[PDB]
Design a protein around this ligand. Structure first.
Ligand SMILES: CCCCCCCCCCCCCC(=O)O
Ligand SMILES: Nc1cc2ccccc2cn1
Length: 130
């Protein structure tokens, strides 16, 4: 849709603070902070696939909107995730150990804008088409 494509990270704000709030350790934050991943988003009927590829870590999720699934995150959290579409925004929530984080993906002009929130921390990541 608006989301389908191969996207390359071009900017990131507050990602270290966001990772710290998730409980990610220093060595992993160091690797994560200067990664510039690609994000490849595809859709095949009810099923959306989001692949994130980087030099030191690949991940992939496939889901149906509104159907909770188990996810192992890039930082090795075991979470229950639910993704819905709200006013053209893909809203992902991850829940684990009584905690939650939201990752909102929106299309704005030319860009894919990803807002990640944990507690008081808001991180914004922008991707452009590859
Ligand atoms: C092994 C390096 C792992 C890097 C740490 C990743 C922490 C998980 C937060 C991922 C948020 C996704 C936001 C995005 O798609 O740009
Ligand atoms: N697979 C994967 C790799 C990442 C590398 C850096 C930052 C975030 C990331 C998210 N997912």
């Amino acid at each position: 849709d608006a989301f389908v494509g191969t996207w390359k990270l071009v900017s990131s704000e507050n990602f270290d603070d966001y990772m710290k709030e998730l409980g990610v350790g220093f060595a992993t934050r160091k690797m994560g902070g200067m990664a510039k991943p690609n994000c490849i988003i595809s859709v095949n009927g009810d099923v959306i696939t989001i692949k994130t590829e980087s030099t030191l870590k690949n991940t992939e999720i496939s889901f149906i909107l509104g159907q909770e699934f188990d996810e192992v995150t890039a930082d090795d959290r075991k979470v229950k995730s639910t993704i819905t579409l709200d006013g053209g925004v893909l809203v992902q929530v991850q829940k684990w150990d009584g905690k939650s984080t939201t990752i909102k993906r929106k299309r704005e002009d030319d860009k894919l804008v990803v807002e990640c929130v944990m507690k008081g921390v808001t991180c914004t990541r922008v991707y452009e088409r590859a």
